Design a protein around this ligand. Structure first.
Ligand SMILES: C#CCOc1ccc(C[C@H]2NC[C@H](O)[C@H]2OC(C)=O)cc1
Ligand SMILES: [K+]
Ligand SMILES: [K+]
Ligand SMILES: [K+]
Ligand SMILES: [K+]
Ligand SMILES: [Mg+2]
Ligand SMILES: [Mg+2]
Ligand SMILES: [Mg+2]
Ligand SMILES: [Mg+2]
Ligand SMILES: [Mg+2]
Ligand SMILES: [Mg+2]
Ligand SMILES: [Mg+2]
Ligand SMILES: [Mg+2]
Ligand SMILES: [Mg+2]
Ligand SMILES: [Mg+2]
Ligand SMILES: [Mg+2]
Ligand SMILES: [Mg+2]
Ligand SMILES: [Mg+2]
Ligand SMILES: [Mg+2]
Ligand SMILES: [Mg+2]
Ligand SMILES: [Mg+2]
Ligand SMILES: [Mg+2]
Ligand SMILES: [Mg+2]
Ligand SMILES: [Mg+2]
Ligand SMILES: [Mg+2]
Ligand SMILES: [Mg+2]
Ligand SMILES: [Mg+2]
Ligand SMILES: [Mg+2]
Ligand SMILES: [Mg+2]
Ligand SMILES: [Mg+2]
Ligand SMILES: [Mg+2]
Ligand SMILES: [Mg+2]
Ligand SMILES: [Mg+2]
Ligand SMILES: [Mg+2]
Ligand SMILES: [Mg+2]
Ligand SMILES: [Mg+2]
Ligand SMILES: [Mg+2]
Ligand SMILES: [Mg+2]
Ligand SMILES: [Mg+2]
Ligand SMILES: [Mg+2]
Ligand SMILES: [Mg+2]
Ligand SMILES: [Mg+2]
Ligand SMILES: [Mg+2]
Ligand SMILES: [Mg+2]
Ligand SMILES: [Mg+2]
Ligand SMILES: [Mg+2]
Ligand SMILES: [Mg+2]
Ligand SMILES: [Mg+2]
Ligand SMILES: [Mg+2]
Ligand SMILES: [Mg+2]
Ligand code: NA
Ligand code: NA
Ligand code: NA
Lengths: 201, 186, 158, 178
RNA sequence: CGACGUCGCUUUUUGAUCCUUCGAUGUCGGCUCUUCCUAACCUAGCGCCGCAGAAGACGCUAAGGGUUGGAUUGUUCACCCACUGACAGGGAACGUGAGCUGGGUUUAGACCGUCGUGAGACAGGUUGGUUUUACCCUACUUAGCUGGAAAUUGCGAGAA
RNA sequence: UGCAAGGCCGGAAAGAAAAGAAUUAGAGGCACCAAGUGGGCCUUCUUCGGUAAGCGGAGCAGGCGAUGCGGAAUGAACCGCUUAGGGAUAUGUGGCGUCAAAACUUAUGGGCUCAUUCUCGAUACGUGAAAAGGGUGUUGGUGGAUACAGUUGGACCAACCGAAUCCACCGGCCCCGAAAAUGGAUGACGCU
RNA sequence: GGCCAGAACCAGCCCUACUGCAUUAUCCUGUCGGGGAUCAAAAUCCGGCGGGCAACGAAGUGCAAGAAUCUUGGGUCUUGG
């Protein structure tokens, strides 16, 4: 079977990524890092909700995949699949080893799984949605974090969606030509570079 | 904490209330009652001229303050007991086997409950009077009469708990003895 | 596993700085090294001839020998309970003139200048006063130092 | 008992230099057991706000702010504390006391017992006396009644230390072993 | 009841380690005998059910009491026959060898297969193969004598 | 007559000023002859293998070994302090209900807590016992909402009735989660 | 008497009593206005102006050097006479 996650909870080792020195690494259990309406413009989903980590620990890719399935299932049931966009912000780049029991001699293990090393304050999941479905997003993320080891807090972001512009100032900056849209995110235009049809505002 | 919390109660004309060391005696017509509240640690006052009963809690948190409304209800029940009394009406409900209830002086016999051969006996304390209504008016009714609400109840409750169905689906087997009317003697 | 060759563990030690690659310049070639000078022994990785061993990189010593392309430097080295004076042979590209006595040389020259000025009726420069003494302070602007509510909300991300 | 914290006013600045020949002068309010703790709290505030270290600054004055006359008042103490679980928590509390120092000292005891907060994790934003009509908490507002009276019940009255006794005759005051 | 995950407990399994013992702490199993634990099979109560009744499922308090006879196997386990209210799981130096037994394991004899040129080897099979000592101290079981309240003294004096 | 080197002769030397502008229980160098030792181990920070270990392996520095004494009930290593034979006076760590010296249970200090068969808690090291999760137990905060309110009685909505309510979230202590074998352990009694 | 004990005095120690300098102002008062809560007030509170020493053992705030001779303190079986 699979070893209990309590054996790989703490960040005891140095980072051990998959490289030309570490071969034979299995694929992570999470492959889809963006569920929901990922193609929605930044104007469509103003509300952003974060799941923030409060401990320095390791989260297995199995737990990450379990969390996103639970969050997607709840939003599809209690809302539509086209009113939210959720992004997993933790990537399992750390490879775990198992000795797989000659006892204790030559005991350097073989790759067994992958996990994400997370710090205090690091964002794990971000949900982009409308203001009408805020209660559903909170419950979906509350259920998803039950799949996570350790303590996490669900907080409401002060920014507009997945951007770095405040919710209180996005619409005013959008009405003026000070914002450049780049898909899910947007960049505030600076008065730098040559005088073009952009950066005039 | 709250410095002063109090509750007030109006005493009717025909009843007198005496308090001494958290021991309340309520005397009116049709009898008298006494309650020992030395476990409460409250301030009980009776205004004899104005016919008011007051209970005060000084410097109390939520738990001690919860007791002064309980005290007022207990004294109010005593006042009602020595002015109107308490009457509990009990009905024997059965599907197939009649519940034969024999009421002698202060003694209750229950027979044929669910066809059982065992006889259920209960001795009513002398402060509570138990009578059986004549079947011509209302079938298989038992009436408990007394001044103390605490004593009149749990005389019917003891009767109810004795006739409990065992090892059967109680949703389907509804036979039992249930209180139906809670009222006053006068 | 790990080995101990002459240049072991010098991946970052014997490397040029970013955008500072290249062979030594003319000013290094034109610099004169004499017996008795103080030199810093800093290896130049682009000159793989007469390099010092990695220990002597960053050590300052005294020149004891000058040769057509080489410099002999005496370097102190602690071994167990004592320090040995090790003589190393390097090419001239791996030594820089040390400024370790620049402050002392200036102090000596200032004393000579002060002595000459004092000898023949010159005005000595005024002595600096200590900044740790007392005095009255007249503040042009005075502000209140306090912790505000805005400080606590500003340290919360997202 | 008298309050264990005193009201200090610390005045200080960055030491003048070529870059800053006329440094700003800052006035700081702090409640500390002694003036050494007061100076320590001042330089911490200077370091985390004005980016000025104690080694690069000087203290102009570290006097004690005297308490007013003792009058029963309502004090509004703006206070905050740090915990690992919840970061910084800022609250506004009302107290009944006779001085600013007494109210702040009572606030530190209150935070220590109800939230397990020690002195060095606590910042006092502001303390001020407020009128009876601006008091919101009923536990404090109950003391503004024009006719407030209560008996003294469940009181353990100890004898004078000189007159205390171990064994006393049951219904008398005669000391048998003392 | 519970996939994907996640948090625990236990030391009745094995593994990991090598702290104690190599001028020696008697090795498996069974027999016998006592005691302890509860994560409760039966027995006493009590809830709940996809609970009509009957038969059952799940759960709570509770270890006082009980928990079998046999065929094969050295077995522990396993399996089957049968009875029963039920035939629960475990610890006590993997309880218990100066208590027994000695079938197994693991000396020397000998046979077979495989391996080895060979002497020999085999967590492969097979047969045959000394089980010592208590009268000491405690513990326990019964069995006698016998002083002593200042627990031997003080005369030191307290009556349910 | 310039550079390099070795000298000789002279001059000057706050013997190193002032600017925060060192300090020293600060005799430096040189030998000779030899002993034990060459199994280590534990802790603070750093750290590698391992699920982990009272596991194996390293760096820096203390320590035990080799060392008692005063404390943490008990413990090689933790805390304090390190030691000629004695007295007095003060302390350190740790304590002041009894055992047991000290609040003969100190204050004319503020709060919080109630824990029914391993029996609340009083364990630095010592994880030398505990998690996720949960509680309309009580006590605190933050932000919203309503105010003739909210709950009742009366006719799925609006009216009588006369006061402060309720919605989410975050703390403190307590509680549940929380099952092992001889009878037993905040050191014991006990303490609210 | 080289034994025991108690009081005297000396010298040296160890203790306790007796306290001055500086500082307050986010303060002390009166008065006007506001505000507050009352049957009506007052007070808590905020401003303007005028005076100022909260000075009883003022403050529990910084530092104290006060000849235990004055003005006959205590201990020394913790020293020696
Ligand atoms: C073969 C085999 C494995 O089984 C055993 C069985 C007994 C022993 C003896 C040891 N037991 C403890 C002590 O070290 C020794 O005692 C004595 C009397 O020597 C060793 C192994
Ligand atoms: K979690
Ligand atoms: K052995
Ligand atoms: K049963
Ligand atoms: K064989
Ligand atoms: Mg498992
Ligand atoms: Mg590691
Ligand atoms: Mg490196
Ligand atoms: Mg480098
Ligand atoms: Mg094991
Ligand atoms: Mg061993
Ligand atoms: Mg033996
Ligand atoms: Mg032995
Ligand atoms: Mg033995
Ligand atoms: Mg049980
Ligand atoms: Mg039992
Ligand atoms: Mg038993
Ligand atoms: Mg055994
Ligand atoms: Mg065992
Ligand atoms: Mg034997
Ligand atoms: Mg045996
Ligand atoms: Mg034996
Ligand atoms: Mg045999
Ligand atoms: Mg052959
Ligand atoms: Mg054999
Ligand atoms: Mg044989
Ligand atoms: Mg034979
Ligand atoms: Mg005697
Ligand atoms: Mg010196
Ligand atoms: Mg060794
Ligand atoms: Mg001494
Ligand atoms: Mg002493
Ligand atoms: Mg004592
Ligand atoms: Mg006490
Ligand atoms: Mg502990
Ligand atoms: Mg202990
Ligand atoms: Mg701990
Ligand atoms: Mg919790
Ligand atoms: Mg709760
Ligand atoms: Mg709570
Ligand atoms: Mg709460
Ligand atoms: Mg105990
Ligand atoms: Mg305990
Ligand atoms: Mg103790
Ligand atoms: Mg005024
Ligand atoms: Mg003035
Ligand atoms: Mg005093
Ligand atoms: Mg004097
Ligand atoms: Mg003297
Ligand atoms: Mg003498
Ligand atoms: Na040794
Ligand atoms: Na107290
Ligand atoms: Na006025």
């Amino acid at each position: 079977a699979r070893r209990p996650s309590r054996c790989y909870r703490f960040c005891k080792n140095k980072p051990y990524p998959k490289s030309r020195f570490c071969r034979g690494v299995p694929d992570p259990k999470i492959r889809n890092f963006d569920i929901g309406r990922r193609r929605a413009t930044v104007d469509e989903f103003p509300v952003c909700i974060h799941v923030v980590s409060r401990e320095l620990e390791q989260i297995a890719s199995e737990a990450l995949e379990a969390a996103r399935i639970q969050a997607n299932k709840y939003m599809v049931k209690r809302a539509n699949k086209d009113v939210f966009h959720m992004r997993t912000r933790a990537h399992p780049f750390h490879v775990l080893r198992i000795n797989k029991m000659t006892g204790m001699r030559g005991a350097f293990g073989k790759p067994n799984g992958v996990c994400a090393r997370v710090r205090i304050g690091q964002i794990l999941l971000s949900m982009r949605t409308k203001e009408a479905y805020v209660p559903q997003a909170f419950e979906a993320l509350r259920r998803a974090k039950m799949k996570f080891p350790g303590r996490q807090i669900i907080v409401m972001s002060k920014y507009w969606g997945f951007t770095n512009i405040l919710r209180t100032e996005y619409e005013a900056l959008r009405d003026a030509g000070k914002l450049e849209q780049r898909g899910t995110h947007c960049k505030l235009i600076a008065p730098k570079g040559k005088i073009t049809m952009r950066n005039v505002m | 904490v709250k410095v002063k919390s109090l509750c007030t109660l109006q005493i009717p004309e025909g009843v007198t209330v005496d308090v001494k060391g958290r021991k309340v005696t309520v005397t009116g017509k049709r009898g008298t009652l006494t309650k020992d509240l030395t476990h409460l640690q409250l301030d009980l006052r009776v205004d004899k001229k104005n016919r008011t009963f007051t209970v005060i809690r000084w410097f109390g948190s939520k738990i001690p303050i919860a007791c002064l409304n309980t005290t007022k209800a207990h004294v109010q029940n005593m006042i009602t007991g020595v002015t109107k009394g308490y009457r509990f009406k009990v009905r024997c409900a059965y599907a197939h086997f009649p519940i034969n209830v024999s009421v002698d002086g202060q003694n209750i016999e229950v027979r044929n409950f669910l066809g059982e051969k065992r006889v259920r006996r209960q001795l009513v304390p002398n402060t509570v009077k138990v009578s059986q209504t004549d079947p011509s008016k209302v079938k298989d009714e038992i009436v408990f009469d007394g001044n103390d609400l605490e004593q009149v109840s749990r005389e019917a409750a003891v009767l109810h708990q004795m006739c409990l169905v065992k090892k059967k689906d109680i949703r389907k087997f509804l036979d039992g003895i249930y209180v139906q009317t809670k009222t006053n003697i006068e | 596993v790990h080995s101990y060759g002459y240049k072991s563990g010098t991946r970052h030690l014997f490397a040029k700085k970013f955008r500072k690659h290249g062979v030594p310049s003319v000013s290094t070639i034109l610099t004169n090294i004499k017996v008795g000078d103080y030199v810093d022994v800093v290896a130049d990785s682009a000159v793989r001839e007469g390099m010092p061993h990695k220990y002597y990189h960053g050590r300052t010593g005294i020149v004891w020998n000058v040769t057509p392309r080489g410099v002999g430097v005496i370097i102190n080295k602690p071994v167990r309970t004592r320090t040995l004076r090790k003589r190393i042979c390097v090419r001239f590209e791996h030594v820089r003139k040390s400024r370790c006595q620049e402050a002392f040389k200036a102090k000596e020259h200032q004393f000579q200048a002060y002595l000459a000025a004092k000898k023949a009726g010159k005005a000595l420069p005024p002595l600096q006063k200590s900044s740790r003494l007392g005095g009255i302070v007249r503040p042009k602007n005075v502000e209140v130092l306090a912790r505000r509510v805005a400080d606590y909300e500003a340290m919360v991300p997202y | 008992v008298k309050p264990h914290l005193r009201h200090y006013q610390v005045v200080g600045r960055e030491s003048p230099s070529e870059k800053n020949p006329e440094p700003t002068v800052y006035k700081f309010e702090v409640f500390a057991p002694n003036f050494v703790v007061a100076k320590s709290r001042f330089w911490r505030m200077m370091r985390v706000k004005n980016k000025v270290k104690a080694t690069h600054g000087d203290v102009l004055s570290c006097k004690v702010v005297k308490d007013a006359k003792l009058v029963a008042r309502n004090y509004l103490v703006d206070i905050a504390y740090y915990s690992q679980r919840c970061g910084y928590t800022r609250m506004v509390k009302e107290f009944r006391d006779v001085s600013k120092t007494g109210a702040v000292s009572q606030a530190y005891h209150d935070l220590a017992s109800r939230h397990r907060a020690r002195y060095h994790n606590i910042e006092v934003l502001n303390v001020k006396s407020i009128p009876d009509h601006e008091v919101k908490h009923l536990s404090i507002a109950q003391y503004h009644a024009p006719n407030l009276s209560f008996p003294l019940l469940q009181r353990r009255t100890k004898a004078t230390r000189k007159d205390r006794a171990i064994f006393v005759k049951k219904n008398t005051k005669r000391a048998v072993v003392a």
